[PDB]
Amino acid sequence: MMPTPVILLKEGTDSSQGIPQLVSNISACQVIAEAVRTTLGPRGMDKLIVDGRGKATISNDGATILKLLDVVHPAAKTLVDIAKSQDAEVGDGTTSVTLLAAEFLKQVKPYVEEGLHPQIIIRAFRTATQLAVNKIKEIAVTVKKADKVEQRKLLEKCAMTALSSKLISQQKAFFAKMVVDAVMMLDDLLQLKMIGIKKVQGGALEDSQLVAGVAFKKTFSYAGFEMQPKKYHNPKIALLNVELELKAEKDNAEIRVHTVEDYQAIVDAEWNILYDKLEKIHHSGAKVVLSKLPIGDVATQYFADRDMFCAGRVPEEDLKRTMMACGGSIQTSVNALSADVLGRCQVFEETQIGGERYNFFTGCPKAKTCTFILRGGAEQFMEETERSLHDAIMIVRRAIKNDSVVAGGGAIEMELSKYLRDYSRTIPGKQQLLIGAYAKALEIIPRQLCDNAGFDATNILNKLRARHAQGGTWYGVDINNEDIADNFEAFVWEPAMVRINALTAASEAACLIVSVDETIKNPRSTVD
Amino acid sequence: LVLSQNTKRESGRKVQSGNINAAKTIADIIRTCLGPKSMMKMLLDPMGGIVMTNDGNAILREIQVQHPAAKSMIEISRTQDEEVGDGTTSVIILAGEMLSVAEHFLEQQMHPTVVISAYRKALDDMISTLKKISIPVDISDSDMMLNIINSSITTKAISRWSSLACNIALDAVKMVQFEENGRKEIDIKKYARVEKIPGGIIEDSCVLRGVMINKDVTHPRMRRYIKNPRIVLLDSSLEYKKGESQTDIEITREEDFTRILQMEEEYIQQLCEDIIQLKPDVVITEKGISDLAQHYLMRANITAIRRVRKTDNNRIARACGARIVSRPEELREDDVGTGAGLLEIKKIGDEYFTFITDCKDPKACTILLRGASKEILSEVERNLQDAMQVCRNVLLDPQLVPGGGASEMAVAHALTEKSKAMTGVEQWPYRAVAQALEVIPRTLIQNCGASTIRLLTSLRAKHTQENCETWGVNGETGTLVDMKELGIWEPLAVKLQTYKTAVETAVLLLRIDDIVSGHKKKGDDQSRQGGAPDAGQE
Amino acid sequence: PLSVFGDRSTGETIRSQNVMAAASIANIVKSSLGPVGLDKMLVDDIGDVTITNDGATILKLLEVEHPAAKVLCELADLQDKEVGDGTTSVVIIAAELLKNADELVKQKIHPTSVISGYRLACKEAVRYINENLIVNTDELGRDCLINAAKTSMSSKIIGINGDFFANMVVDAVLAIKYTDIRGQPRYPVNSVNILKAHGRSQMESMLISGYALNCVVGSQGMPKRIVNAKIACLDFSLQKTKMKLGVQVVITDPEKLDQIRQRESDITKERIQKILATGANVILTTGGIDDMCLKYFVEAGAMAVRRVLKRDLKRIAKASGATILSTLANLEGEETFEAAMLGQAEEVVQERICDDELILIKNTKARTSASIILRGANDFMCDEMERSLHDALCVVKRVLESKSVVPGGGAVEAALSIYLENYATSMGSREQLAIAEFARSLLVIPNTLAVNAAQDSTDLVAKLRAFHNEAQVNPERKNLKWIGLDLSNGKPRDNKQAGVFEPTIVKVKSLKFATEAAITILRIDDLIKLHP
Amino acid sequence: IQDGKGDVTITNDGATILKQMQVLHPAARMLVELSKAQDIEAGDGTTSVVIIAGSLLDSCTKLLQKGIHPTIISESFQKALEKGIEILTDMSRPVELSDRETLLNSATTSLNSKVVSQYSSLLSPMSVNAVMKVIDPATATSVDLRDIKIVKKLGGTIDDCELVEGLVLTQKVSNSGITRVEKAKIGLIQFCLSAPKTDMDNQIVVSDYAQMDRVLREERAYILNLVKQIKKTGCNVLLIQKSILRDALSDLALHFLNKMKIMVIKDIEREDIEFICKTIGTKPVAHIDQFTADMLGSAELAEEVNLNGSGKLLKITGCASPGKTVTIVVRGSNKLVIEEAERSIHDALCVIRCLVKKRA
Ligand SMILES: Nc1ncnc2c1ncn2[C@@H]1O[C@H](COP(=O)(O)OP(=O)(O)O)[C@@H](O)[C@H]1O
Ligand SMILES: Nc1ncnc2c1ncn2[C@@H]1O[C@H](COP(=O)(O)OP(=O)(O)O)[C@@H](O)[C@H]1O
Ligand SMILES: Nc1ncnc2c1ncn2[C@@H]1O[C@H](COP(=O)(O)OP(=O)(O)O)[C@@H](O)[C@H]1O
Ligand SMILES: [Mg+2]
Ligand SMILES: [Mg+2]
Ligand SMILES: [Mg+2]
């Protein structure tokens, strides 16, 4: 090229064009996939990443891992994006989505290198994706009985599957019961803010617990809080948005008096304002008082003398959960404290949980809320436990809304590879290669399972291809036996939407990455 | 890493368009230096020198570039200058135009090999058409040769003194013509030296029937004017020098030092006697001459000149008809040089100059240039080299071709007419290379300050008739003329070499799609060239 | 824990790196493969420019640091040394074998098994070529040589002019033919001299029946043309005689000094007289010739040439019938020069070539020799022409030594892909995959040809494989074996009838060398790079 | 292993790996010396010995932690070592070197570990023939592999390796035109064929042109008398030792030898002299007076064979009174596979040597 006295773009513009640019995009995607490969499946491992602040994060969750990697490659950002999208729409499959997208790209890399027009590749991807999605919706098992015991069994198995990859697999049956107990209490929108997850360092995973009620940590008590009682056996609960303390009646308020009698009247007036609020709260019958706003030392001692319980600065979310659990309403005014707005539980307590003090409202039968209390030996231990439970909870919600299950261990992947191989053998011959490549790519899930487990993925995939071509649709990897097995009978169940969205997202990422033929980086402004 | 950090690599349409643009830039540098109305350029050498010229090779030779395509174009100009000695701008412009019309086809999805095949076909047919429209010439017609040389200098600054320069070049080339042992030769490079003495007037510049050197007598008693000098040429020093071996002497006797010094003097006497045996008038040496040797030669009434360059001595040999010798004992009358008619040694300016300038049948000459300054005389020398190289090209291949772009238009028409039968996919590049030949008339018209569109249209139309292969442009009036009426006739060799170089470089630059740069030489051991064995060869 | 003073890559990391390096090297040259391949510029950090299509040349000029890439560069060099063609195809094939083999190793197929399969596939591909894909040049005559030369010259800057360049190449190889013990005809190329001279077009390149020397006469008074050339090839210098190191001149009688000085020159004179006494009109010497001696040659009417190159001298001697003499000394303790030690030639000339003269020795007896003067537009073109012509000469030499050729245009690679993908089914289960991958790798040559032609690589190679499968499963259609790519039309074509021939040794050695290189790189599973 | 320089090494040998990667830790350096000792004593097993050492130490870790003194550990290891010697000797079986199949299998196993495992069918029999030529299977108690010269030549494939029974020399032929001597009588001279030169500081003092000419004449006569005394014995191949003091072969001597039709090969190295003489049966001649026919070696052929544009080799094929010496020519396509081919062949030879002594 030539200098050209005046240049078109700003000096520093980096333009990568053509087949080399495309192959480099595919290679960057391969890197991103490798970064999460070893987390896939029951034999998957966790990753430790460290930030500039020096805080470490340990996770088996692919979305988390990729969020933490400071990926900057414009083409490799797309895998991060589709992992985020999977975590958003479904809550599981985040590693599978990245693996599938990268494997589609890897499989079409040879044809891309030999000048095959990308439009042809994206057409093939769209076709094979629609076919595989319709096939999942076709062979997905949806029990049409609406039986409750079978609908709890289904959710428990889907949750156990979603949890058989984490550091809580050795208690996953335990946690699965709780996850179901958790989502079977939420009302109809299955709000996640309605499930509380407290992390109390200290204790074992089996020491973790679910409270069908609410629980939250003690909140900056003043003097007299230890004079209060700490157990109530049928309390009525006043939930408030009220600051209970001697304060300026208003910030723009100015008192003006010209008499010492008026001075004393004003002092006593502040005191009577406060004492009137407290007396209304007391006469409502409430033996427990929670305020989203502070409760001063005067109010603390007042309630201690009346043998009531008070907690201020309660977080808004914990208050809303207390409301949905005990059955009251949050009051900014204490002037109408009817039993209609008070809440009620069978037991209130303040107990010690591993160095911390926690208030438990337990016994709420009308509870649309639950609170997980997770124990463990490290901040990141408990954080990854919470992430695992988030996967299980999202899985259980999606299953509740559509109990249409497929099998795992790569069973569904092998079935779709079979179906698409068959379909490709019936079409002209250009799309044949690309749809066969789609099929060969789908095999990355059982292959990676076998790899992470320490098997001979080749022999196992041979067994699977044969057994799926002989008749049989739910045969996949059996990890503890280093073999294959009917995973639908082994109860390796997976909501169909998981793999549906995985294929959709992976195919979209592949099509996007493959449609880009040029990358133009402008030079950074405000260089620094 | 895999390749070095300094290793860059470009590839694809970017490289192609970049090479073509570099070539087009080289062509735009010297596009205005074409024709009889060209303008001069004053280039500044890195040695503080100055070069005023309208010579394509001079310009592109004083420029330096870093793009390899531009390097290739400068090498084009060098090749054309060395081969034919003219066309150094026409070749560059034609290569630029061909690369442009190839950029047109590479923008589309045509492969460069297709363009190259079409270019090779077009070159074959250009050659055929040039040989078909050419005419012969009787090289014995001095007026014809002078007009041929005028058609080559009319474009250069010495066009003002045209009869003079033409006669100079013609006389010089005709004299330096030499046949020996059945092998014809000209060799304007080694003989026909151009010596330019700044000062005087250019109209007094002349070609001598002999040679001239910048030397004086060794002793002021020598003659500076001899009217029938017998001349001897030597490669050996007329001094007493050491031997090749370790010849250390050992003296014990008193008479031995004096006897050894007298032995030296007697050796010098013996050399000079070997010389005087042949009775020469002038003795010319490439090496030195001792003062005692001067004494002996002077006693013999011999004028001696020393420390002459080997090339000058060879020219003197060719001029006066002598054979250079290295051992005076082996001197013969067959080696003595008769043929010179006058040796003179005259003060030109403040410098003594030796002339041997009345020779009969001199096979070498000296063109004595006189003028305003060193730069002006350097330009005159370059123009004279053009003229003499053209005269030589003619004497070798006496076929003539019309100029003014007439040949370019005739060939363009012939190729356009042959392209109709093609009916393939190479007809477009073929017909582009045919219409790329018109950049010569076009450029000419531009340098006149006339209307390219109208004139080139009228000319393209004229050249479609039957007997119109000779119609072209008048570069001083901006009109159309018959070349047999104007007089601008180029040598067929010049045009053939021009077209060939242009087409071949277009081919060379179209075959390039990738550039790897920055890598090191990997060669430091005294610049390894060829030293190695092979597989037997018996 | 190790404490080694260096870096360490291990496992999939270093394997991926090796494959990346090999791929990089192969992608450098992939664009220069086949009649539609294009040339490359190379700039030497100083403005020194080199245009070339020769893969070995390109990889020699490159500045490579990775060892897995140095291996492929050395591979191209070795192919250039042992064959003279295939230097690009061998690199491409080695890199593709590495790619597919590393893909297998990622699937956790052991590298030993991949290596066994590659070795087996190489053996069987060589055998299948030698048994099914060879054509004997005897059945075809001389046009086979011209077609092989044109096939090698396609993809070079002497491509379309191959129609004529091949004739020159063929003539030259036939000219330098010599028969040895066992009566085997040998064609020792590198005895054809190739000179470069920018100027007249390529079509004006010249084949000289004889020899051409990039030298000139030593004195301008000497003749520059001689007809009945009697040639004396000398391996010593003609200068004033200097006594050797262990000899000193010590004068104690001044009356001797003159005579001693005189001999220092008279000795050399006598030698020259002896030479000239035999009739020698041309005297070539590897050493120098003082002016004193040049005068003897001038007066005799002889042509002396100094500083000639030893190899040029050996070739002129073998071709003209002369004997290179390091000394004028016989077995009788005297010093003489016999007229039998002379060579002969029908002419010796100093010819003008673009303001630069050279020497032409034309029509030598006792053997025929060959020179080629390449004529182009500048030094870059001429250098590329020299390299291309050397490739063509090597190709014709191989065709004449081993009289077997194979078709081009990916025909051999397509046939081997078919046969090896069918043959893998019998050999093990993982070695089976390795042999299938070797087969698939072989297709990178027609793939690259089609890609470079800017055509549908997939469709074309699929049609190729279809033709060759029909040929290998229908015994009445084995004549389809000769089908390969037509890159001027993008269509398969009978390449044996089209004239696209390559020496069998090219493909065979390409496969063997590519397989060995791939195995060597595919055996590395660790790397320790020590700090300098 | 890419060392401090650009020297690359692809290797499967434990001794080579360890000595090529500077380890920078006293214990690691001791392990390097251990692998060296195994390479000396046995020649193969250099990885196994290092792995055994590392494993014994990793075992000592937990013992030290248990609280055992690291002198109890050493002596108990000595105990286990003697008992293990006993066990291994008990499970061993004797072998006679006449059993060619046991040797072939030993060599094949030594090579399976290596890169040339593919070319085992070629390199194993050559590695057994080499050790069987340079010894007397009966009464032999060791093997000197210095009697087995390996000659690495870049070019061809590993399938082109050879077991030249004579000797091969990279020193080229100076006699241009004369190669492939049949019925060759070979003479190895340690004296110089050039102008006379005393061991003292000598000079030739000229004081008359007559002496000047006579000097060259007498030099020619001296050199010619030398080449005649060589030719008269029937010698047609001439190996000349390397001389750095004075010219071992003047151009005049080369001219005369060529006219006498004698192949001449100079620059022979002073370390190859015992090898060349043991191979051909020549006897080194240091004085022209003793250059007799009885000091020559009769070979059936001596040729300079081209390696397909990858150099040249001076190969002598056939030799009367053949010596307990053999040469292996190692071909290859890159210097790294060649270097590992050489090392692998050395491992096989050292296996057969480990078999000649301690026949178990
Ligand atoms: N017990 C099991 N046996 C075999 N395969 C399993 C088992 N549990 C989960 N899997 C499979 O492992 C995969 C889960 O991948 P994982 O990394 O755990 O979560 P994600 O869904 O985010 O990829 C699914 O294909 C699932 O079918
Ligand atoms: N008087 C003229 N009128 C028209 N054309 C001319 C005239 N004189 C020369 N020409 C042509 O114009 C071109 C001038 O060439 P010039 O400028 O000397 O550069 P070069 O000869 O080195 O290419 C030549 O093609 C010549 O034939
Ligand atoms: N005229 C042709 N038509 C079709 N294929 C050709 C032709 N010439 C060469 N080829 C193919 O291109 C491949 C590479 O050729 P080329 O690049 O010239 O040699 P190299 O690979 O040694 O650089 C060869 O294998 C040959 O089969
Ligand atoms: Mg999961
Ligand atoms: Mg001109
Ligand atoms: Mg080739």
Ligand SMILES: [Mg+2]
């Ligand atoms: Mg071993």
